[PDB]
Amino acid sequence: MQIFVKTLTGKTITLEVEPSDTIENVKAKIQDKEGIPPDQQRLIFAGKQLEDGRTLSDYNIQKESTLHLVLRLR
Amino acid sequence: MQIFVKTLTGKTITLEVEPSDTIENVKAKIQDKEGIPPDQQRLIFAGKQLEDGRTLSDYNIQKESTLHLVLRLR
Amino acid sequence: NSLEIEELARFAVDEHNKKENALLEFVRVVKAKEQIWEMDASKETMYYLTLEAKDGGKKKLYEAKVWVKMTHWIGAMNNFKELQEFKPV
Amino acid sequence: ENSLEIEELARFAVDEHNKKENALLEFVRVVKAKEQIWEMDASKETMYYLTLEAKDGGKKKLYEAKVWVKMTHWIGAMNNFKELQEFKP
Numbered sequence: 001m002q003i004f005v006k007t008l009t010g011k012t013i014t015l016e017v018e019p020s021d022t023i024e025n026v027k028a029k030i031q032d033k034e035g036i037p038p039d040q041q042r043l044i045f046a047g048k049q050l051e052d053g054r055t056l057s058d059y060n061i062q063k064e065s066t067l068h069l070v071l072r073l074r
Numbered sequence: 075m076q077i078f079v080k081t082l083t084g085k086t087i088t089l090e091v092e093p094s095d096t097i098e099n100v101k102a103k104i105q106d107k108e109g110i111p112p113d114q115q116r117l118i119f120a121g122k123q124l125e126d127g128r129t130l131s132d133y134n135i136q137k138e139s140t141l142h143l144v145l146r147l148r
Numbered sequence: 149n150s151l152e153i154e155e156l157a158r159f160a161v162d163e164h165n166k167k168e169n170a171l172l173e174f175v176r177v178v179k180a181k182e183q184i185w186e187m188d189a190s191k192e193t194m195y196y197l198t199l200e201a202k203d204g205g206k207k208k209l210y211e212a213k214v215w216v217k218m219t220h221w222i223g224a225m226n227n228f229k230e231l232q233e234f235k236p237v
Numbered sequence: 238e239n240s241l242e243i244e245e246l247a248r249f250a251v252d253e254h255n256k257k258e259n260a261l262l263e264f265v266r267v268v269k270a271k272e273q274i275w276e277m278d279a280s281k282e283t284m285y286y287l288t289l290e291a292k293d294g295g296k297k298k299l300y301e302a303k304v305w306v307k308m309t310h311w312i313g314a315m316n317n318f319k320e321l322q323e324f325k326p
Contacts, residue, residue: 140277
């Protein structure tokens, strides 16, 4: 399926993923498409911080869902 | 000199640069330190979008000044 | 609400005036249309505001487009708004 | 930085704490406020340290919460990001 990842400003990218994919894999897609390192990506969904270990289905991230991305500069 | 780069959320890094240096070189420093490609970096100062061709002194970015960084997701 | 749209229109006028060193005097909001994106938490909004503003001193009609993204998660809230385009009728 | 904006930041802190720990705190009032502000030209970073009274079991108790609020505005847009940084008795 296709999901959205948006920043706080409303700039949007789209990644084709499967519910089996991991947040680490999503951040790898974001690195491949846009070039932002995964260690800088703090992903947000459903009023929760997303952990690199859990899957999209764990968070009930169905088709056409949108995640948010905040840069950390860690 | 030392300058600050913050995101819209308040995450902060510090870079050592010279007023002769260009915004392209600063964005390259951000790439080296934090890993964000310069093509994704939209740097803000004095309420202006910074052009990669001009220098820090052109925009009156004095020592210890603070810039803000917004992701572009090209 | 009409207050939040009034404030978004004053936002548009102020930011455009700062964008061109113009001095447009906000009068009122005549018509407002918006496109809204909703989700469990964030609410994305593109406002298509038709406002009245004074250019030389006499009222003129301008259409402003403001992008407003409110993102909040547990413990926090972000409110980003951005003037994306400003143009008269 | 005024008592209305502090009231709203305190209600933000109490509500977000309630959602973060599934607590049910009844906001009473803000007793003391301390703040740290950076006011760079066209930006305002603020860490609010508010000690407010709220009743957890029905009787008032005293909690200090610190909420981070960053107001970033540039020529075309403005961001208002706020984040509950700590809630503690």
